Design an enzyme around this catalytic site. Structure first.
Site, PDB file in Angstrom:
ATOM      1  N   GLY A  83     -10.432   1.143   6.853  1.00  0.00           N
ATOM      2  CA  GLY A  83     -10.866   2.525   6.867  1.00  0.00           C
ATOM      3  C   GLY A  83     -10.978   3.386   7.733  1.00  0.00           C
ATOM      4  O   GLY A  83     -10.109   2.651   9.168  1.00  0.00           O
ATOM      5  N   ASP A 129      -7.446 -12.371  11.297  1.00  0.00           N
ATOM      6  CA  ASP A 129      -6.654 -11.027  11.379  1.00  0.00           C
ATOM      7  C   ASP A 129      -6.060 -10.926  12.447  1.00  0.00           C
ATOM      8  O   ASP A 129      -6.399  -9.103  13.254  1.00  0.00           O
ATOM      9  CB  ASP A 129      -6.728 -10.071  10.410  1.00  0.00           C
ATOM     10  CG  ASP A 129      -7.100 -10.230   8.776  1.00  0.00           C
ATOM     11  OD1 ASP A 129      -6.085 -10.905   8.395  1.00  0.00           O
ATOM     12  OD2 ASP A 129      -7.990  -9.315   7.550  1.00  0.00           O
ATOM     13  N   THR A 149       0.966  -6.963  10.721  1.00  0.00           N
ATOM     14  CA  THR A 149       0.506  -8.066  10.622  1.00  0.00           C
ATOM     15  C   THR A 149       1.172  -9.436  10.293  1.00  0.00           C
ATOM     16  O   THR A 149       0.236 -10.993  10.546  1.00  0.00           O
ATOM     17  CB  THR A 149      -0.763  -8.525   9.008  1.00  0.00           C
ATOM     18  OG1 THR A 149       0.138  -7.659   8.030  1.00  0.00           O
ATOM     19  CG2 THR A 149      -1.988  -6.493   9.179  1.00  0.00           C
ATOM     20  N   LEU A 188     -10.696   9.119  15.859  1.00  0.00           N
ATOM     21  CA  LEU A 188     -10.225   7.841  16.280  1.00  0.00           C
ATOM     22  C   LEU A 188      -8.739   6.971  15.957  1.00  0.00           C
ATOM     23  O   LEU A 188      -8.298   6.896  17.069  1.00  0.00           O
ATOM     24  CB  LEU A 188     -11.484   7.341  16.863  1.00  0.00           C
ATOM     25  CG  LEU A 188     -12.677   7.332  17.485  1.00  0.00           C
ATOM     26  CD1 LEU A 188     -13.673   6.570  17.891  1.00  0.00           C
ATOM     27  CD2 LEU A 188     -12.574   8.219  18.720  1.00  0.00           C
ATOM     28  N   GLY A 191      -8.497   2.223  11.048  1.00  0.00           N
ATOM     29  CA  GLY A 191      -8.192   1.059  11.478  1.00  0.00           C
ATOM     30  C   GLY A 191      -7.776   0.133  10.092  1.00  0.00           C
ATOM     31  O   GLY A 191      -7.804   1.075   8.929  1.00  0.00           O
ATOM     32  N   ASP A 241     -13.140  -5.550  14.846  1.00  0.00           N
ATOM     33  CA  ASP A 241     -12.927  -6.321  13.310  1.00  0.00           C
ATOM     34  C   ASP A 241     -13.526  -7.932  13.194  1.00  0.00           C
ATOM     35  O   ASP A 241     -13.025  -8.148  11.781  1.00  0.00           O
ATOM     36  CB  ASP A 241     -11.667  -6.171  13.049  1.00  0.00           C
ATOM     37  CG  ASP A 241     -11.556  -4.548  12.409  1.00  0.00           C
ATOM     38  OD1 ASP A 241     -12.380  -3.484  12.238  1.00  0.00           O
ATOM     39  OD2 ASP A 241     -10.544  -4.139  12.475  1.00  0.00           O
ATOM     40  N   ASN A 274      -6.040  -5.267  17.411  1.00  0.00           N
ATOM     41  CA  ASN A 274      -7.326  -5.237  17.418  1.00  0.00           C
ATOM     42  C   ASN A 274      -8.107  -5.736  18.261  1.00  0.00           C
ATOM     43  O   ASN A 274      -9.082  -6.286  18.777  1.00  0.00           O
ATOM     44  CB  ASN A 274      -7.586  -6.120  16.464  1.00  0.00           C
ATOM     45  CG  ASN A 274      -8.044  -5.947  14.490  1.00  0.00           C
ATOM     46  OD1 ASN A 274      -7.898  -5.076  14.489  1.00  0.00           O
ATOM     47  ND2 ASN A 274      -7.385  -6.923  13.481  1.00  0.00           N
ATOM     48  N   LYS A 299      -4.776  -9.652  15.951  1.00  0.00           N
ATOM     49  CA  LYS A 299      -3.429  -9.180  16.215  1.00  0.00           C
ATOM     50  C   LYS A 299      -3.718  -8.155  17.699  1.00  0.00           C
ATOM     51  O   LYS A 299      -4.857  -7.823  17.897  1.00  0.00           O
ATOM     52  CB  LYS A 299      -2.771  -8.111  15.061  1.00  0.00           C
ATOM     53  CG  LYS A 299      -3.798  -7.230  14.577  1.00  0.00           C
ATOM     54  CD  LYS A 299      -2.889  -7.633  13.049  1.00  0.00           C
ATOM     55  CE  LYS A 299      -3.461  -5.634  12.274  1.00  0.00           C
ATOM     56  NZ  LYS A 299      -4.773  -5.943  12.088  1.00  0.00           N
ATOM     57  N   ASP A 354     -10.983  30.729 -10.099  1.00  0.00           N
ATOM     58  CA  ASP A 354     -10.581  32.887 -10.035  1.00  0.00           C
ATOM     59  C   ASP A 354     -11.282  33.343 -10.857  1.00  0.00           C
ATOM     60  O   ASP A 354     -10.835  33.451 -12.279  1.00  0.00           O
ATOM     61  CB  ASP A 354      -9.409  33.173  -9.625  1.00  0.00           C
ATOM     62  CG  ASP A 354      -9.149  34.215  -8.805  1.00  0.00           C
ATOM     63  OD1 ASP A 354     -10.074  35.327  -9.333  1.00  0.00           O
ATOM     64  OD2 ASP A 354      -7.709  34.540  -9.518  1.00  0.00           O
TER      65      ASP A 354
HETATM   66  C1  LIG Z   1     -15.450  -3.456  11.989  1.00  0.00           C
HETATM   67  O1  LIG Z   1     -16.748  -1.758  13.264  1.00  0.00           O
HETATM   68  C2  LIG Z   1     -15.744  -0.965  13.688  1.00  0.00           C
HETATM   69  C3  LIG Z   1     -14.268  -1.832  13.894  1.00  0.00           C
HETATM   70  C4  LIG Z   1     -13.284  -1.031  14.711  1.00  0.00           C
HETATM   71  C5  LIG Z   1     -13.722   0.228  15.630  1.00  0.00           C
HETATM   72  C6  LIG Z   1     -12.579   0.673  16.350  1.00  0.00           C
HETATM   73  N1  LIG Z   1     -11.525   1.368  15.768  1.00  0.00           N
HETATM   74  N2  LIG Z   1     -10.723   2.504  16.480  1.00  0.00           N
HETATM   75  C7  LIG Z   1      -9.377   2.619  16.417  1.00  0.00           C
HETATM   76  C8  LIG Z   1      -8.559   2.166  17.485  1.00  0.00           C
HETATM   77  C9  LIG Z   1      -7.640   3.233  16.895  1.00  0.00           C
HETATM   78  C10 LIG Z   1      -6.117   3.179  17.508  1.00  0.00           C
HETATM   79  N3  LIG Z   1      -5.523   1.751  16.781  1.00  0.00           N
HETATM   80  C11 LIG Z   1      -6.800   0.731  17.108  1.00  0.00           C
HETATM   81  C12 LIG Z   1      -8.174   0.910  17.260  1.00  0.00           C
HETATM   82  C13 LIG Z   1     -11.923   2.130  17.662  1.00  0.00           C
HETATM   83  N4  LIG Z   1     -11.489   3.060  18.461  1.00  0.00           N
HETATM   84  C14 LIG Z   1     -12.820   3.042  19.524  1.00  0.00           C
HETATM   85  N5  LIG Z   1     -13.678   2.281  19.772  1.00  0.00           N
HETATM   86  C15 LIG Z   1     -13.913   1.708  18.506  1.00  0.00           C
HETATM   87  N6  LIG Z   1     -15.114   0.526  18.473  1.00  0.00           N
HETATM   88  C16 LIG Z   1     -12.838   1.385  17.763  1.00  0.00           C
HETATM   89  C17 LIG Z   1     -15.093   0.619  15.241  1.00  0.00           C
HETATM   90  C18 LIG Z   1     -16.356  -0.165  14.659  1.00  0.00           C
HETATM   91  C19 LIG Z   1     -17.393   0.553  14.539  1.00  0.00           C
END
Ligand SMILES: COc1ccc(-c2nn(CC3CCNCC3)c3ncnc(N)c23)cc1C
Length: 450
Positions: A21, A132, A172, A15, A18, A153, A137, A134, A320
């Site tokens: 991680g 944080d 940020t 996906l 973030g 987050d 998020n 923004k 090898d």
């Molecule tokens: C702290 O737990 C988190 C935080 C962010 C996400 C999350 N992260 N992301 C990645 C996105 C990738 C593009 N930038 C914004 C965030 C998600 N996309 C769709 N659904 C989600 N729930 C997410 C998922 C979890 C379980």
């Protein structure tokens, strides 16, 4: 007893990246429920709290429920990782949806901000601070027109330490409350970040801006800003009044989330010209941030692939035992797996079955040839995204980025002014103040020692 993440979930696809991680789209192996799984590398991200404190926050987060806050279902911990399993949202980031609109008014800005405040107010009632907050998020629940916002987050910043690397902290600086900079902060910091976001919705320009990250923070810390940009003449007085209250310097004097919900502005405008200039500025601002971010991720992937190509070759050479330059599929899997133990970046292949599938994807496309293809597969994902971000930034389809624009982009990317000009001189000794895409790419290559 101590349940294992991968006994329950299989990874389907990535996906994206973030804070703390990578996020993988996953699927329950029995029920077929899709979920977004954020995978935090313990090696890469240090904890701020003890285990029992994180567990208790997590137990609370699982029980909380609000329409504007991501739902967390599950939490796992193994040797090297934390796995946060939540609801998946498919509408993308708010700002990318906003820039796709023909028109955007204070009523649109108000409905957005009421949602964020309403999510914040609930989380503060439960003693959880974001810190944080923004635009990145703020996710849209799905692709629909009247899509709810979902804040991601909440709670993580209390337990994990932010990255100091620029590729992780793009954007940020504009949103952080001054009190977070000095170390004494509480839940009012989220009202501040929301006020900066509101300021950007109505003007398309950060209230605290500057040429690089440190310049922005200097502006934030001083705490002064104005409504002197001409696009403010078109905005209601009560909206500015709200902004002034949310961006009040001393936190105890700053309005609460709860009270900001009752402000005239929210009450009047959630029941009227289009802010054309604001949309234009937001679109430019989003384009700038995404290109800078894509540039830094490209350079990283190139350094990573340089590291891992050499690493995988030495692993495959040692394997090898024939000396013949060739290996079986079985040994190729053992070496690829061994590359994955040493390193700790592949969230997308956190299971023995996942590694076999990547290997099979590469074999379908003599270990030397396998190494080229396995690693080009990594980098071209970030390379195609760079070009796409370049094309997006070049809104007039000129094919070129000017020197003024490179300065803005490299300022946001924290690449030193003298350093990138020297690189340009080395790519094109006669350049006339502009670069096409391949020259830009050539510059980035030189800026990561290639
Ligand atoms: C702290 O737990 C988190 C935080 C962010 C996400 C999350 N992260 N992301 C990645 C996105 C990738 C593009 N930038 C914004 C965030 C998600 N996309 C769709 N659904 C989600 N729930 C997410 C998922 C979890 C379980």
């Amino acid at each position: 007893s101590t349940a294992i993440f991968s006994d329950r979930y299989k990874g389907q696809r990535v996906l994206g990246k973030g804070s703390f991680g990578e996020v993988i789209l996953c699927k329950d192996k029995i029920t077929g429920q899709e979920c977004a799984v954020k995978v935090i590398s313990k090696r890469q991200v240090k904890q701020k709290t003890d285990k029992e404190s994180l567990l208790r926050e997590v137990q609370l987060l699982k029980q909380l429920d609000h329409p504007n806050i991501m739902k967390l279902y599950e939490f796992f911990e193994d040797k090297g990782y934390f796995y946060l399993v939540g609801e998946v949202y498919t509408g993308g980031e708010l700002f990318d949806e906003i820039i796709s609109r023909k028109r955007f008014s204070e009523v649109d800005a108000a409905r957005i901000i009421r949602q964020v405040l309403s999510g914040i107010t609930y989380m503060h009632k439960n003693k959880i601070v974001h810190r944080d907050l923004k635009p990145e998020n703020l996710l849209l629940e799905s692709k629909s027109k009247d899509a709810n916002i979902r804040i991601i987050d909440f709670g993580l910043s209390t337990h994990f330490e932010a990255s100091k690397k620029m590729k992780d902290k793009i954007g940020t600086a504009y949103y952080i409350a001054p009190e977070v900079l000095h170390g004494t902060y509480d839940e009012k910091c989220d009202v501040w970040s929301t006020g900066v976001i509101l300021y950007i919705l109505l003007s398309g320009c950060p209230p605290f801006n500057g040429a690089n990250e440190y310049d922005i923070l200097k502006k934030v810390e001083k705490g002064k800003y104005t409504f002197e940009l001409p696009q403010w003449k078109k905005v209601s007085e009560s909206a500015k009044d709200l902004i002034r209250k949310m961006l009040t310097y001393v936190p105890s004097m700053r309005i609460s989330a709860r009270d900001a919900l009752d402000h005239e502005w929210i009450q009047t405008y959630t029941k009227v010209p289009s802010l054309d200039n604001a949309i234009l500025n937001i679109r430019q601002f989003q384009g700038t941030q995404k290109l800078a971010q894509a540039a830094l991720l490209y350079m990283g992937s190139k350094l990573t692939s340089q590291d891992e190509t050499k690493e995988l070759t030495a692993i495959f050479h040692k394997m090898d035992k024939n000396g013949d330059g060739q290996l079986d599929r079985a040994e190729l899997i053992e070496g690829y797996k061994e590359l994955m133990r040493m390193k700790g970046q592949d969230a997308s292949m956190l299971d023995a079955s996942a590694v076999e599938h990547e290997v099979d994807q590469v074999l379908d496309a003599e270990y030397s040839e396998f190494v080229t293809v396995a690693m080009d597969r990594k980098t071209l994902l970030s390379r195609e995204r760079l070009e796409r971000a370049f094309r997006m930034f070049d809104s007039d389809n000129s094919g070129k980025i000017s020197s003024t624009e490179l300065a803005t982009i490299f300022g946001v990317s924290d690449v030193d002014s003298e350093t990138w000009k020297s690189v340009l001189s080395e790519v094109d000794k006669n350049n006339d103040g502009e670069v096409d895409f391949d020259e830009f790419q050539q510059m980035l290559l030189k800026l990561c020692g290639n």
